[PDB]
Write an enzyme that holds these catalytic residues in place. Structure first.
Site, PDB file in Angstrom:
ATOM      1  N   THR A  69      32.254 163.394  76.487  1.00 14.44           N
ATOM      2  CA  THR A  69      31.531 162.567  77.429  1.00 14.44           C
ATOM      3  C   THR A  69      30.899 163.419  78.558  1.00 14.44           C
ATOM      4  O   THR A  69      29.706 163.208  78.900  1.00 14.44           O
ATOM      5  CB  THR A  69      32.430 161.481  77.989  1.00 14.44           C
ATOM      6  OG1 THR A  69      32.899 160.668  76.870  1.00 14.44           O
ATOM      7  CG2 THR A  69      31.726 160.521  78.909  1.00 14.44           C
ATOM      8  N   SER A  81      30.533 156.371  78.311  1.00 16.80           N
ATOM      9  CA  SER A  81      31.750 155.816  77.697  1.00 16.80           C
ATOM     10  C   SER A  81      31.740 154.326  77.958  1.00 16.80           C
ATOM     11  O   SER A  81      32.152 153.881  79.051  1.00 16.80           O
ATOM     12  CB  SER A  81      33.003 156.464  78.217  1.00 16.80           C
ATOM     13  OG  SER A  81      34.081 155.798  77.494  1.00 16.80           O
ATOM     14  N   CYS A  94      39.349 156.000  85.047  1.00 16.37           N
ATOM     15  CA  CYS A  94      39.439 157.377  84.578  1.00 16.37           C
ATOM     16  C   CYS A  94      40.238 158.274  85.507  1.00 16.37           C
ATOM     17  O   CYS A  94      39.933 158.452  86.684  1.00 16.37           O
ATOM     18  CB  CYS A  94      38.015 157.978  84.472  1.00 16.37           C
ATOM     19  SG  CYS A  94      37.998 159.690  83.841  1.00 16.37           S
ATOM     20  N   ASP A 131      27.998 155.715  71.422  1.00 18.68           N
ATOM     21  CA  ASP A 131      27.760 155.897  72.828  1.00 18.68           C
ATOM     22  C   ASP A 131      26.571 156.859  73.039  1.00 18.68           C
ATOM     23  O   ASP A 131      26.341 157.805  72.281  1.00 18.68           O
ATOM     24  CB  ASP A 131      28.993 156.456  73.541  1.00 18.68           C
ATOM     25  CG  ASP A 131      30.093 155.490  73.942  1.00 18.68           C
ATOM     26  OD1 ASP A 131      29.773 154.406  74.499  1.00 18.68           O
ATOM     27  OD2 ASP A 131      31.321 155.752  73.780  1.00 18.68           O
TER      28      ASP A 131
HETATM   29  C1  HEM Z   1      31.413 162.028  83.148  1.00 17.62           C
HETATM   30  C2  HEM Z   1      32.561 162.140  82.357  1.00 17.62           C
HETATM   31  C3  HEM Z   1      33.529 161.027  82.139  1.00 17.62           C
HETATM   32  C4  HEM Z   1      33.290 159.726  82.068  1.00 17.62           C
HETATM   33  C5  HEM Z   1      31.986 158.933  82.176  1.00 17.62           C
HETATM   34  C6  HEM Z   1      34.568 159.071  81.835  1.00 17.62           C
HETATM   35  C7  HEM Z   1      34.775 157.696  81.672  1.00 17.62           C
HETATM   36  C8  HEM Z   1      35.953 157.039  81.440  1.00 17.62           C
HETATM   37  C9  HEM Z   1      36.102 155.641  81.239  1.00 17.62           C
HETATM   38  C10 HEM Z   1      35.009 154.642  81.198  1.00 17.62           C
HETATM   39  C11 HEM Z   1      37.463 155.384  81.054  1.00 17.62           C
HETATM   40  C12 HEM Z   1      38.137 154.104  80.903  1.00 17.62           C
HETATM   41  C13 HEM Z   1      38.779 153.623  82.226  1.00 17.62           C
HETATM   42  C14 HEM Z   1      39.308 152.203  82.144  1.00 17.62           C
HETATM   43  O1  HEM Z   1      40.160 151.978  81.226  1.00 17.62           O
HETATM   44  O2  HEM Z   1      38.880 151.352  82.935  1.00 17.62           O
HETATM   45  C15 HEM Z   1      38.135 156.672  81.152  1.00 17.62           C
HETATM   46  C16 HEM Z   1      39.505 156.880  80.961  1.00 17.62           C
HETATM   47  C17 HEM Z   1      40.153 158.110  80.896  1.00 17.62           C
HETATM   48  N1  HEM Z   1      39.513 159.339  81.040  1.00 17.62           N
HETATM   49 FE1  HEM Z   1      37.552 159.661  81.490  1.00 17.62          FE
HETATM   50  N2  HEM Z   1      35.595 160.017  81.792  1.00 17.62           N
HETATM   51  C18 HEM Z   1      34.958 161.226  81.950  1.00 17.62           C
HETATM   52  C19 HEM Z   1      35.631 162.435  81.981  1.00 17.62           C
HETATM   53  C20 HEM Z   1      36.990 162.640  81.836  1.00 17.62           C
HETATM   54  C21 HEM Z   1      37.644 163.962  81.814  1.00 17.62           C
HETATM   55  C22 HEM Z   1      36.971 165.239  82.177  1.00 17.62           C
HETATM   56  C23 HEM Z   1      38.920 163.739  81.477  1.00 17.62           C
HETATM   57  C24 HEM Z   1      40.045 164.717  81.418  1.00 17.62           C
HETATM   58  C25 HEM Z   1      40.202 165.768  81.971  1.00 17.62           C
HETATM   59  C26 HEM Z   1      39.091 162.309  81.298  1.00 17.62           C
HETATM   60  C27 HEM Z   1      40.244 161.677  80.966  1.00 17.62           C
HETATM   61  C28 HEM Z   1      40.474 160.290  80.831  1.00 17.62           C
HETATM   62  C29 HEM Z   1      41.739 159.667  80.545  1.00 17.62           C
HETATM   63  C30 HEM Z   1      43.012 160.376  80.180  1.00 17.62           C
HETATM   64  C31 HEM Z   1      41.544 158.325  80.590  1.00 17.62           C
HETATM   65  C32 HEM Z   1      42.538 157.200  80.421  1.00 17.62           C
HETATM   66  C33 HEM Z   1      43.029 156.645  81.765  1.00 17.62           C
HETATM   67  C34 HEM Z   1      44.033 155.563  81.629  1.00 17.62           C
HETATM   68  O3  HEM Z   1      43.915 154.723  80.730  1.00 17.62           O
HETATM   69  O4  HEM Z   1      44.979 155.503  82.493  1.00 17.62           O
HETATM   70  N3  HEM Z   1      37.880 161.678  81.523  1.00 17.62           N
HETATM   71  N4  HEM Z   1      37.194 157.698  81.366  1.00 17.62           N
END
Ligand code: HEM
Length: 399
Positions: free
Chosen positions: A239, A282, A348, A389
């Site tokens: 992403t 995402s 996130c 996506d």
């Molecule tokens: C621009 C980059 C990114 C976008 C747009 C993005 C977007 C998202 C979105 C839409 C979710 C879902 C949140 C929800 O359930 O409401 C999420 C969850 C998550 N993201 Fe990202 N993310 C990005 C980068 C990252 C990076 C760099 C990491 C790790 C180092 C990461 C790790 C995670 C994890 C582990 C979750 C699950 C959180 C949970 O359910 O407690 N993300 N992200």
């Protein structure tokens, strides 16, 4: 009931269905690949409600969960990590790793993020483009997030290039199923050895903190530490790559926005805000089953029915974001949060890190390369397949 997921209207655009639904049918049923139904929620207010309601669950063993593909259904069989947990298990596990990702921690990481971006830009410059364009994805958009998350996890520097390549094979559209699965398992096997090593001699990385603070006291097992580390690697990396590439393409698409950013790189935070709203890379993660009946708008969602809340559609909701289909880095933001990173307790974990990576990229790239240009006509950009996506596979550039 139309089939879902919907295909994007064109390379850089959302599915056309969502604007129509927001106007006339904001909470409606869609049909998934297996013939099951789910409620699709399209308005910002309703997406926020779905994201925060304690009557809704992320547990994938609940009948009614909206799995969107055959592979999603097989993946649901494994032991869950915190992404798929409800309270109190969710924060019990997520809190084990959220220290690295706090706003203050990310502020303190800024010099490291900057150095990583600077170094990759300089390698690009040393390579040059004297013999023709280079692929900004392979040379830059891919390694920036990859090097950062691997380094934070604990991978040593000499292994970054190879492991960056192997993680890309997991998600590359050109990989065969065997190739992607082998890469997945290769990475897991690698992280297992790192867990063994950091249990014997911790270092100052996320895996070592899991080992010392959670494995050694018996709070989790080694296998759990591996799966938590793996989730942090694979959740967001592809992403991030797509967001960098999409940002470069968007600046090329809107020359006066680029002109503004070049004249004032302090606009990078606001550029990034608009990018994370406009390009919701995402869009399929805010999924639930109802544990009991819940009313959403003019619809009743019954117990054991599935729900998909489109943050992409929410981010184009004209009631919240005026002129939502315009990319405007000078947007006048409303009180309501954009939902590029989701909402509620599951929002996130890496939102602050991701925004810092993107802000660093977009405050640096055109200082390094003021004459950076996409080296093909913009209408020929190679986007991700339209049933996926939004993203960019490769992006030829000169500079
Ligand atoms: C621009 C980059 C990114 C976008 C747009 C993005 C977007 C998202 C979105 C839409 C979710 C879902 C949140 C929800 O359930 O409401 C999420 C969850 C998550 N993201 Fe990202 N993310 C990005 C980068 C990252 C990076 C760099 C990491 C790790 C180092 C990461 C790790 C995670 C994890 C582990 C979750 C699950 C959180 C949970 O359910 O407690 N993300 N992200």
């Amino acid at each position: 009931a139309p089939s879902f997921p919907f295909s994007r209207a064109s390379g850089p655009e959302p599915p056309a269905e969502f604007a129509k639904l927001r106007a006339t049918n904001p909470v409606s049923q869609v049909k998934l690949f297996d013939g099951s139904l789910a409620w699709l929620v399209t308005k910002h207010k309703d997406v926020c409600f779905v994201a925060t309601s304690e009557k809704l669950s992320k547990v994938r063993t609940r009948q009614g969960f909206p799995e969107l593909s055959a592979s999603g259904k097989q993946a649901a069989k494994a032991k869950p990590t915190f992404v798929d947990m409800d309270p109190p298990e969710h924060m019990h596990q997520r809190s084990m790793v959220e220290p690295t990702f706090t706003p203050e921690a990310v502020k303190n990481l800024q010099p490291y993020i900057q150095r990583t971006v600077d170094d990759l830009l300089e390698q690009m410059k040393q390579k040059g483009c004297a013999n023709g364009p280079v692929d900004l994805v392979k040379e830059f958009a891919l390694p920036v997030p990859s090097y950062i998350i691997y380094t934070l996890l604990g991978v040593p520097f000499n292994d970054l290039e190879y492991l960056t390549q192997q993680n890309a094979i997991r998600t590359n559209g050109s990989s065969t199923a065997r190739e992607a699965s082998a890469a997945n398992q290769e990475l897991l096997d690698y992280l297992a050895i790192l867990v063994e090593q950091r249990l014997v001699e911790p270092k100052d990385d996320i895996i070592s903190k899991l080992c010392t603070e959670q494995v050694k006291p018996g709070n989790i097992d080694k296998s759990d530490a591996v799966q938590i580390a793996f989730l942090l690697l694979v959740a967001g990396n592809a992403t991030m790559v797509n967001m960098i590439a999409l940002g470069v393409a968007t600046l090329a698409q809107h020359p006066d926005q680029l002109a503004q950013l070049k004249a004032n790189p302090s606009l990078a935070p606001q550029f990034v805000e608009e990018l994370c709203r406009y390009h919701t890379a995402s869009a399929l993660a805010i999924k639930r089953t109802a544990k009991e009946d819940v009313m959403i708008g003019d619809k009743l969602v019954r117990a054991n029915e599935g729900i998909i809340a489109s943050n992409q559609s929410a981010n184009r909701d004209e009631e919240v974001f005026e002129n939502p289909d315009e990319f405007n880095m000078n947007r006048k933001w409303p009180p309501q949060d954009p939902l590029g990173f989701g909402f509620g307790d599951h929002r996130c974990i890496a939102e602050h890190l991701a925004k810092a990576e993107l802000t660093t990229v977009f405050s640096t790239l055109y200082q390094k390369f003021p004459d950076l240009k996409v080296a093909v006509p913009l209408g020929k950009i190679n986007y991700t397949p339209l049933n996926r996506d939004v993203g960019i596979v490769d992006l030829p550039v000169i500079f």
